[PDB]
Amino acid sequence: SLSSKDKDAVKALWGKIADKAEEIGADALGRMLAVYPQTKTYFSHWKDLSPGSAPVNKHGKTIMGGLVDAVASIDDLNAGLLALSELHAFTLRVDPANFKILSHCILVQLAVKFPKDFTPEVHLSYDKFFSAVARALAEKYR
Amino acid sequence: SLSSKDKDAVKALWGKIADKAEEIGADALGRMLAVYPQTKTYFSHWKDLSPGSAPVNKHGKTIMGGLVDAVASIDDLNAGLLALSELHAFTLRVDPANFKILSHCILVQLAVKFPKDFTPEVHLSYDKFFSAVARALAEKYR
Amino acid sequence: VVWTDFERATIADIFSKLDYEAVGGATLARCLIVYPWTQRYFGNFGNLYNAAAIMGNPMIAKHGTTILHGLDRAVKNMDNIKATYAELSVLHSEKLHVDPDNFKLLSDCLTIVVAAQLGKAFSGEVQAAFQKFLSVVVSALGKQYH
Amino acid sequence: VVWTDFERATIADIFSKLDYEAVGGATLARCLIVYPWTQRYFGNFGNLYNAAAIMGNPMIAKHGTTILHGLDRAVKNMDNIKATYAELSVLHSEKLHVDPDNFKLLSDCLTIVVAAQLGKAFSGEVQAAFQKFLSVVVSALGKQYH
């Protein structure tokens, strides 16, 4: 469960990254596809999976849109992300191992661009946030 | 999140075991210690980890004592197991993989006695219950 | 891995008690029901949209049996499980990218199905040997780095 | 495992760029703070009451250096990592009983510490080579059933 401290720190980071948010998502995705090629299968119906392609760029915006919704719904992630849960956990049957993969790639990208934001304590809140997003997204599995 | 169906399957099972709960707790803890010895470290302060011995017996009770409490508070496990979460996740720093192991051994002990109750849909409900118990116990880690 | 005589005898007699079709079908159906994301790996298997659909699907029955016969290859070759499973590892990891956590989920379903069939005979000691066997199988099915 | 030239040289390059004591200490601190149940394995390593306590713990700085030098050992034995780690595997599994998911947690903390230091140079292809290396390392540290 996210504390008030964790929510402040998440919202803060989210304000820092707005200008780059679209780009953060696009590259994080390129990291996931290259570094964890077990995930490629979920997106092979696109036209191109390369780090800078039109489909990766477009989907990276969409991921960051969903995380923005998460930030909006931070007080109740389970209720707030339910349509995305139905999509990921029921319709697409995304293996839950994959959610932590994406989260990690997002943190890696955020760290490469925002090194000073990543104190242990801040990273703890970010991790709790991404863990809670994944639990929210897992609601509709079963 | 547990459906009304899940809560109902779980309460019915617990209703069915009631008689033998202490015993089931005993044998299931004895399974964990033997089948997954990585868990012995938590209980090495006793001077008999061998199953069938009083420390396993007495501790098997309190585990099942902990689950019936959990069953009683099934509508909000987070709130209902706060004190136990403080003890496990905070004080004892129980590695979370371990909650999964004990849960498994409890199901296995039950399976050997209540085979008719282990239909796929009932097993799924049990497994959602133990997962939610583990998550509630995990609350006070961080 | 050094098998004790008990471990060897136990694994052999567990498997001599199992009907590979019955147990294999039930195990796989159980896995697709208790952990429904595993379905995505068998997308070309028919109606998996409901528990009653999975239960009555003959593709699952067929493949469940195949799982048990693959396990049998380890039972007959207990000291050479890694090599016996080399091509299976390539298939599950390199070709099909099955997240390794699922090998353990399936193993756990098989355990619970065996426990239910065997009853009291499935003691802690018996479950000890069974899990050791499954641990070795699961390690062998995972990606080989060495 | 089979290394391409890029993988081999990326790995050597990354470590050539690391302050082992600085990166080691940050990495272990990061892991005990972000994943606090990992503290239990380090019970006799001084005060771990809080973030700032882990951060000023001389023992946690010392052991972070040890981990990094342990990693450097694999970098020096890239084609024999399993054997190089055989004793470490036995310690972490048979004596310490470290749940294998903790190896991945520590690995992830290291990557993020490395990411924050190298910035744009720590690319997807570079993280790819680094993850492959950590995967091999983690696999060699886990219990050997074969």
Ligand code: HEM
């Ligand atoms: C941080 C966790 C995640 C968030 C917030 C997220 C967010 C979103 C959003 C907002 C969409 C809407 C796009 C649509 O309707 O097609 C979407 C789609 C999708 N997601 Fe996720 N996602 C996450 C994780 C994952 C992971 C780990 C995978 C698989 C490895 C995945 C696979 C997909 C796929 C295949 C689509 C549809 C893509 C397409 O058809 O172009 N997602 N996601």
Ligand code: HEM
């Ligand atoms: C569903 C899972 C679990 C439940 C319901 C549960 C419940 C309980 C209860 C009611 C107690 C007694 C508290 C007291 O003495 O005041 C206890 C103690 C304890 N538990 Fe658990 N527990 C669970 C999982 C685990 C696991 C997985 C481990 C680690 C292998 C563990 C290790 C311990 C230890 C070391 C104690 C204290 C022993 C003692 O005072 O004699 N527990 N638990």
Ligand code: HEM
């Ligand atoms: C105890 C662990 C397992 C064993 C012993 C096992 C065994 C086997 C065997 C013998 C085959 C046939 C290979 C051949 O054609 O020669 C196979 C195929 C396959 N397995 Fe596994 N398996 C295991 C776990 C899993 C899990 C957990 C999944 C998914 C979560 C999985 C997914 C598949 C798929 C998708 C195929 C190919 C099916 C097709 O033809 O479409 N397996 N497995």
Ligand code: HEM
């Ligand atoms: C890539 C991962 C890791 C590497 C390369 C590594 C390397 C090492 C090395 C070189 C030692 C010294 C062993 C000796 O004295 O002979 C050690 C000790 C130790 N490690 Fe790890 N380790 C790793 C992960 C972990 C993790 C994840 C944990 C627990 C969360 C852990 C817990 C310990 C403990 C408790 C010791 C002994 C400390 C003592 O002597 O008091 N290690 N490790």
